[model samples]
Target: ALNKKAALKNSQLSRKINQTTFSNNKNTDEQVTKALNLSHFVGSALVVKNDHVIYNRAFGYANKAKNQRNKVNSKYQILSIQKSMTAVGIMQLVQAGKVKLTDPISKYYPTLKHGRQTTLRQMLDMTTGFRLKSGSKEFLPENQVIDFAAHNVFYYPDKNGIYNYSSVNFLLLAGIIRKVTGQSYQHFFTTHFIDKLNLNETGFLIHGQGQDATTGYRALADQTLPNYDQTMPESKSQMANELGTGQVYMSTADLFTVESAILKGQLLSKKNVAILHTRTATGEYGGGVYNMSNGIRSHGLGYGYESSIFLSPDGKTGVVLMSNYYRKAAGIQATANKIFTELMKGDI
Candidate 1:
């Protein structure tokens, strides 16, 4: 019934969202800003075509209390899109002959009781049958993330496989990457994606990182901002808990840079990039990114923040939306869809 509800909701969204023919009015920024003018939207956006920036806009507050306006440089917590990044990291290892997609995860972490049965490909594609432990919460400490995953029992692996989404899967993948590379996952990701790409605005989230590392907010009935030390550093382990799942902080511009690189074969070879574009058994996600059906791909979500990165198969165009609006169902995605639909139609 939940799945049915999602399908119906998605169908409704697709039908309603696809109705508008997206044509640039030369006021693309104003149009998008108006489209996403929700009380909770606090972040940045970028639209790129053929390796050039077509539209980039930042609105709302990085620190609301301080009235710090979010700018092109302001970073947001880009959630599950980190999965695609992890997939890239994995494929890099694969290309280097340090890892195999078919290899069972037990090869690296034998202590994980079910690791022997779960293949890296299954983990990447969300078919491992491993669910998060009951009562597991997001943003757990690094050790706790491992303990929860290791202690959680895997349901019997099915012939067709079930898509059970959990951060633990990618977290474990990060573990494997660390074990295989003999380096911190951060080090590997920084060296390959951040430093190599010169993504100066992108890195792990840490407190005291200034206005660039924006504060995240949750939408509540009262609309009051959640409290936290704007200066106290969140532990590296806590950040690592998000691990390969969703822990990176990046601006819309930098995110566009990475996406453009991915589509252009700067980060991964064309063959490996094709792997990310493949649809999975569930037909909803593949290679750690949401397929979004058709040729449009998206990942990221509405947690204490929301983000979406849409990429065209040909790499000719893309639209990115990053927001701090944390709610069960926010309209940010619809806004993004609307904007992307227009972008796909060519210029006004």
Candidate 2:
């Protein structure tokens, strides 16, 4: 029933959004100022509407060591957006009956033990009984993976809507994709999504895998750059075991192409694509949610990385900001938000 509801809604939005475009009176500078003020670390962004670019730029350097700067085409890891994309990947398999969203993890991977109460929806919505493990460096075999909150199992009396934010949900999600697809996550994404869509410049971020990948950065409170241990950053452990849950890289323009393709319903049937924007039956935005205001639409997620992708709800204009480091400062999300707001105002 839920899948059927999603299929019907995707069809409506797909048709309306595909023909979106920016008005002639766009304000480009306000958008730039918003991006300038929002990000302290390296940033690259793209804005499009009706298949035309209204704004595209990169600041700082892709490789500070090489003194190579980022252009609109330079690729940066998109973090959790990969999770959203991964969600679409899983749904494709669901549509094919290879898997079901409600299926429990233990059903596929005997190693995972969840109290039957935890459904795949909880993890996808971040309302899982799993404890928050956002600050952890890695979910290596040495550490306790998912905590089944026995005592506080039912954090929300209503049982599930969307709560604790963490990557473990996606970590286990990757596991499910692997169990059913009979292929690694990277291989699955490559062959099914990326290759199928002709996404050549985009890929899961397995460190040491690409020729010109951007460096991941994080700013300390004192504003000093610090070194941290690298973990599995790929789309899934299957492709490159570095980090399956979070590290996804793509050029700003290609990322635009991805969003466009998605908007155009080229990646999935228009019916399934509409499910992308539907408010989950749980009354929660399953993967990410965007509300349209001031002619701009924005949505954010906090799993492996942080990013906000925006566009006109009508699909006339869109902005995507991808950064390597999560911001400790207040400006990052704010700046990106302001940029989209400005774009809505015209010519920023």
Candidate 3:
């Protein structure tokens, strides 16, 4: 239950955050806003207090073409949030004894030699010796990239106790999921996690299903200010085929379900769940941004395209913020990080 006053205050604060960013990048905002205003749009945001949803709102377009604005029920793709789901999926297998965190790659796929040394845990923690680029092949057509990624050995420089982020890390995990369970990643997830968690509007992106969700956009690699969907990774792949490495679509309700399910221990076993949230040896993370503050506290973590979930000071309260715009002028992740920090200082 939210007090009307505090709700109003957060709303104003959210708007101010948006305005401040727009004002600082007036020119960029105008151009983006012009195209965006053509379709009323708002960022989707949510907050959870332990088991209850205290705040859930959408500030943008759901079907702007039809003048339908974004609402709490609207579905949004949590870009990298998919990674978190992938992590959860792996933990399920770990809990089942179908796989072990320390299981070596050679035991699973002997063809593409990553030198029999990498383990399943390394994949999840993203401490594998594979280069961050190893995950790039994941963007290629699924059939073509799988074998090379699974077997091809590469001398990726170990971060020397530092955590290295890579897509292949999770992509391989996805592959191993199939190899181990004899189930496609999609089917496995739907059966084990999505349906179980009651993620009504979430799971691998299905094209015709989410036409109104949101489109992926990114400026030319060299030009960050101007938005261009052509340069985005999704632009090249047919929507139907796009999967993994930030292509999962979801809604606030489902997003809430995901957060709630994980926090409630409905997703993974107690032991595996503990490993899922624990920080890696390196202060840095390979998936959506997460930073631990002052060794005693962890702050600034986000997931998905338009969605992000973070722990409040108590590690019980969860903060989620998401948006449709691929590149909001002021980095949404950075803004949310600062806001979460400020928000934690105040009474929840």
Candidate 4:
């Protein structure tokens, strides 16, 4: 049902765009900002085509209490979108012959129920039935976190083939990274992408981190940045617990840089990228990305911050929206879809 809901929305976007003819419009920034302003967007927006910036700017504030303004590079918690990074990391290992997608996870966790049947690919694709009960209830040690997830397993052979979104899958994959590399998930992934790529605007948000991080908000009534900070203790605890699933932050530019690299053969082969991003279903959550009609789309949410990225196969055309304030779902994400639609049509 979750898969169907997302797939339906994806198809609707495709249909809406398919009904129109493509044309060029040079006032790209104006059109995007107008759409964003109409939606009351309050964060960073980056739109590109043919590897050129169409729109690059920030709206609203990073901290309203401090009167700090947002910049094009202001980092925001990317939440589940981090899964794409993890999947790419997994692909690297697969390319290196260090891991196999078909290898059952029981090799690592012998005690886990259904572990013998659950392949690493299924976990990455989110076909596994395992779910985390208290994903962020406490900041326990990594092993303890996995143990808790093991206890929360729900399975039946009937529904095993369907995609079901769960962070525990990537949590376990991070652990697997630790097991194979004999290095922490943070160290391995960070060294490869953040350090090597010099993603100056990217870093983990774990424990007093997020130097340029924006505070998330849902300002429907009287909410403010300071108020949000004071009340999110548990959510902050979730920061470290998220681990590789999404404990990191990055500016929209950094997000686009990394994603474009993946498609441009900087991280993995174009063939592997195709396999991972392929849509096996209506809104196939292949590897880590949802296969959108034009190319692919990724969305993440947590702590009131939401992110959307739309990328073309060549990696030249795309849209990135990172927000710390959003009142509801369709408002911000819908704006992103519309912007991508215009991007392909050269309207924005």
For lDDT, the strongest prediction is 4
Q: Is candidate 2 or candidate 4 better by TM-score?
A: 4
Query: By lDDT, highest first, what's the ranking?
Result: 4, 1, 2, 3
Question: For residues 1-348, what per-residue lDDT tens digits would candidate 3 score against the true structure?
Answer: 334443454454455554532222234324333323322334666555555665565664444445556666666666556666777777787778787777887787677544467777666666767753333423455544455566553646555235765656766777777777777777877787677876667756544345445533442222223233342334334332234446566775676566556646777765556666666767545222343551112122122134556654233555566665443332344344433443454423
Model 1 C-alpha lDDT per residue in residues 221-267, reported as the tens digit of each score: 32323332333234555565677877788888888778768778888
Q: Model 3 — which ten-residue stretch has the worst lDDT?
A: 295-304
TM-score of each: 0.83, 0.71, 0.72, 0.87
Q: Candidate 4 residues 39-78, lDDT tens each?
A: 5577899988999986898988788778777788899877
* Better candidate by TM-score, 3 or 4: 4
lDDT of 1: 0.69
Please write out the lDDT profile of model 2 over residues 302-327, one tens digit for every residue.
Answer: 32234657656555577787765444
Off by over 4 Å in 4: 1-26, 209-211, 220-236, 281-283
Model 2 TM: 0.71
- Off-target runs (Cα >4 Å) in candidate 3 are 1-41, 63-66, 132-145, 151-154, 217-244, 284-306, 312-316, 342-348
lDDT (Cα, 0-100) at 234 in candidate 3: 44
Ordering by TM-score: 4, 1, 3, 2
Which pairs clash in model 1? 22-342
